[PDB]
Amino acid sequence: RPNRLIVDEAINEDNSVVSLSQPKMDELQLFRGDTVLLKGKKRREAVCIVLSDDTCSDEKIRMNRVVRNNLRVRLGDVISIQPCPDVKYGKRIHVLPIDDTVEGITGNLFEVYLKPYFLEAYRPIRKGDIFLVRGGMRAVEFKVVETDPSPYCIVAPDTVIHCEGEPIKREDEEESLNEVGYDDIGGCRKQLAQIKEMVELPLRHPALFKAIGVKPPRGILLYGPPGTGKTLIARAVANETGAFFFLINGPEIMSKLAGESESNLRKAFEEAEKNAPAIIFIDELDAIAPKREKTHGEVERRIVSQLLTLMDGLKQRAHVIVMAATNRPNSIDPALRRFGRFDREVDIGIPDATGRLEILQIHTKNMKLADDVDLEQVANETHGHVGADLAALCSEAALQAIRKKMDLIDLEDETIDAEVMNSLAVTMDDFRWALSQSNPSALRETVVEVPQVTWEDIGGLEDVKRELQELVQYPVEHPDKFLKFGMTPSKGVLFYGPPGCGKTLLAKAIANECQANFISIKGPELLTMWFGESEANVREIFDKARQAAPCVLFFDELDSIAKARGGNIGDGGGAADRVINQILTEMDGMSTKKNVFIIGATNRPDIIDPAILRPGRLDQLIYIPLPDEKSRVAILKANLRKSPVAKDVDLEFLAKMTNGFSGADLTEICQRACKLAIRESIESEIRRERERQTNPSAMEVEEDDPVPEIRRDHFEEAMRFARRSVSDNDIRKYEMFAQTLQQ
Amino acid sequence: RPNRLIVDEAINEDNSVVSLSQPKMDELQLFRGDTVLLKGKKRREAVCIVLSDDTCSDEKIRMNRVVRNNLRVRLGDVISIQPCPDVKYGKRIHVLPIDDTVEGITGNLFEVYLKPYFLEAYRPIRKGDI
Ligand SMILES: Nc1ncnc2c1ncn2[C@@H]1O[C@H](COP(=O)(O)OP(=O)(O)O)[C@@H](O)[C@H]1O
Ligand SMILES: Nc1ncnc2c1ncn2[C@@H]1O[C@H](COP(=O)(O)OP(=O)(O)O)[C@@H](O)[C@H]1O
């Protein structure tokens, strides 16, 4: 490609001149005084006059700073140059000065600057061009916004110009089409990777894709909670690849006037057809295309059918990609899912802890933070937040810093503007306040994320860990052996044992080891979904588990069904069987292709419905015994991290003494010890408090407060309240059931 | 300039009271009951009587609504305060009610309103105020 050209410094200072080398000049067949089109980054064009220069190298183009600013490039970049012999002479232009160039001028710009520069100049101009004018003592900056014809015109003696108007701002707010590259997205690595994978080819290289003869995608759905940054993803992709991003808003299209709404939508599609590889973004799709039964009037049906027709009318045409955003996948009319229409579904989920840290790191860029910010805990204590909430949090933190500072009787002379932000910072207290006065918007949304509990957190249980890593790790890492040998891997494991032995810890540990998502369905929700809603909820939870593979779906307190079934009511039995039967039907519909692992946990195995325990469904049964000896020491050490452990004492004898104790009792003892220590510390502090009030000026020197003396005596007093969580007969029942299992 | 102060909401609802902190009185040698001269925006002017109050901050001045509208300033702005000891007892006063406040009274306003309000008050006034 003999069009790519690296940039270089220019010799002459004229605005509309670039120096070209003779070999390229003859190669490209250019002549003196001609006009060419210069294309740079961020979709910027430029018109110039080609000039010859032997000094400039072939690979380098000599060009000045004004054109570099106009094209938004820098030294060492690449700019393509194309001949432009079809330039049309202009007839009228509009020129306006920038805001920060006419301070205290108060004169007519037509004769002082415009007339000397534009006489016999023949300088072509284009929209968006920023150029500098040198005159008496100030460098006047001018902006050309209107021309005829547009955007190509040439200054001629028989032309009329006008410079009457208010001094326009620098670039107003036109930062979106220059900003929001890939540097402005955090915590969306996989989704962004998929979008880049499946969109780069149809937008970057259309000719090759046409030549191949393969159908491109024609629709992509981005569904997620509001404020997670979907339109920002679309804007970033369109602005990066290079296209004609053309946004359509839902509500504005809806209520235009009576029956003329579809005319605007058709005009939008027609405009996008004519104007090169472009991306059409439809926002709030559910607002215009809800479910068919939901619609009551007739205009809505007309709008939906018009959208469907215009979608099916995209056969070949050009390289147009349609992207839509919606809140809930089932809220869209199911007719908008056939092949040819929206078919590819991408899920933008709530950010996780690392995602929250990345978002916070991105946003806190203009602010000059103090040397006390440790955003790790600030991120990890904000579960249930989206991007917009974090942006609002940063804004409120800055405003609260202003509040704690104030313009102290500072007369607002506009002089105190730059030292406002360049004197201040942020401290923990501001962010803690903002967190306190915050309104999370996620709350009740199922969280999909890799848990952080490792094998070290649990203690002992070597055989059970071995069995789980056997049943989970091998089929995913060495599937070739299973395929060649011809076996079906197991699909479910059921944990049964006395309560509080650490089943969910083990499930989260294996989820962390496998590096797969985790979804927890607790007992209360399962019991709730009896009364009505016995089909939907199960449907979307299984669908979400499937689509985000790999994952380890967890069902806790599975016996609660028949536990609530038995009693003085006997009315949830139909609800019980319907819930269990949707569970069973969805479980049998699984396919081995997706690595979806089901784990159920219960503490009363004698009551579970026997239909579950069949091949294909949950089959393997693993028994979790009570911790013993080394397990007790391991769990005591695991609970013994804290910040204030001091040097402390041995833990062996504590494990030796307790016999018939589960994890709940040990955690209870650990909490009791810390409670006693804190009570002692606070009463000592209060003693110091009223002894200072008794004796003023007694402790003018800042004597050290009592240390974290977590003493043996405090532990021995606290754990004195030792409770036996589990009875004894339950162990016999469990062991009898286990012996019944073995034959 | 340690003379100006920022206006603030007050608690005393009398028309001729202001609330200053004791350090302000210590700095400006301000007693209790003296006559102070208040300058504000639009070149408006009024006089008042200084009263002690510890609730307000040192940089903050508390003042009621009638004086605030007299000075043509809103809360959050700045005013200039100084001692004004050259005031002496007046001789004659000419007062006239506003049109859209006396619709349907038709009585001796002197015995009804002015006599109790001006009684044993020693309220300083300046021409043009309301
Ligand atoms: N990396 C990011 N992830 C999610 N949201 C972000 C990110 N960076 C910025 N945002 C926020 O997203 C907002 C724009 O997204 P928005 O228009 O709310 O999407 P939608 O309209 O789909 O909710 C911006 O105001 C910005 O504060
Ligand atoms: N390996 C272990 N052995 C015993 N107890 C543990 C172990 N690991 C963690 N624990 C403690 O036991 C508790 C387990 O509670 P949980 O597993 O939620 O109850 P359940 O066992 O009924 O699901 C946790 O609070 C944890 O601190």
Swiss-Prot record, chain A:
Molecular function GO labels: ADP binding; ATP binding; ATP hydrolysis activity; BAT3 complex binding; deubiquitinase activator activity; identical protein binding; K48-linked polyubiquitin modification-dependent protein binding; lipid binding
Effect of G297A: Does not affect methylation by VCPKMT
Modified residues (Phosphothreonine): T415
GO annotation, biological process: aggresome assembly; ATP metabolic process; autophagosome maturation; autophagy; cellular response to arsenite ion; cellular response to heat; cellular response to misfolded protein; cytoplasm protein quality control
Catalytic activity, as annotated: ATP + H2O = ADP + phosphate + H(+)
Impact after mutating L119D: Severely reduced binding to DERL1
Keywords: Acetylation, Amyotrophic lateral sclerosis, ATP-binding, Autophagy, Charcot-Marie-Tooth disease, Cytoplasm, Disease variant, DNA damage, DNA repair, Endoplasmic reticulum, Hydrolase, Isopeptide bond, Lipid-binding, Methylation, Neurodegeneration, Neuropathy, Nucleotide-binding, Nucleus, Phosphoprotein, Transport, Ubl conjugation, Ubl conjugation pathway
The UniProt record lists the keyword Hydrolase: yes
Modified residues (Phosphoserine): S16, S441, S681
Outcome recorded upon mutating R138H: In IBMPFD1; without frontotemporal dementia; abolishes enhancement of K-294 methylation by ASPSCR1
Stated consequence of mutating A211E: In IBMPFD1; increased ATPase activity; no defect in ubiquitin-dependent protein degradation by the proteasome; impaired autophagic function; defect in maturation of ubiquitin-containing autophagosomes; decreased interaction with CAV1 and UBXN6
Record-listed E.C. numbers: 3.6.4.6
Principal location: cytoplasm
Function: Necessary for the fragmentation of Golgi stacks during mitosis and for their reassembly after mitosis. Involved in the formation of the transitional endoplasmic reticulum (tER). The transfer of membranes from the endoplasmic reticulum to the Golgi apparatus occurs via 50-70 nm transition vesicles which derive from part-rough, part-smooth transitional elements of the endoplasmic reticulum (tER). Vesicle budding from the tER is an ATP-dependent process.
PANTHER family: AAA-FAMILY ATPASE, TRANSITIONAL ENDOPLASMIC RETICULUM ATPASE
Subunit (UniProt): Homohexamer. Forms a ring-shaped particle of 12.5 nm diameter, that displays 6-fold radial symmetry. Part of a ternary complex containing STX5A, NSFL1C and VCP. NSFL1C forms a homotrimer that binds to one end of a VCP homohexamer. The complex binds to membranes enriched in phosphatidylethanolamine-containing lipids and promotes Golgi membrane fusion. Binds to a heterodimer of NPLOC4 and UFD1, binding to this heterodimer inhibits Golgi-membrane fusion. Interaction with VCIP135 leads to dissociation of the complex via ATP hydrolysis by VCP.
The protein, known as: Transitional endoplasmic reticulum ATPase
Native species: Homo sapiens (Human)
Lineage of the organism: Eukaryota, Metazoa, Chordata, Craniata, Vertebrata
Gene that this sequence comes from: VCP
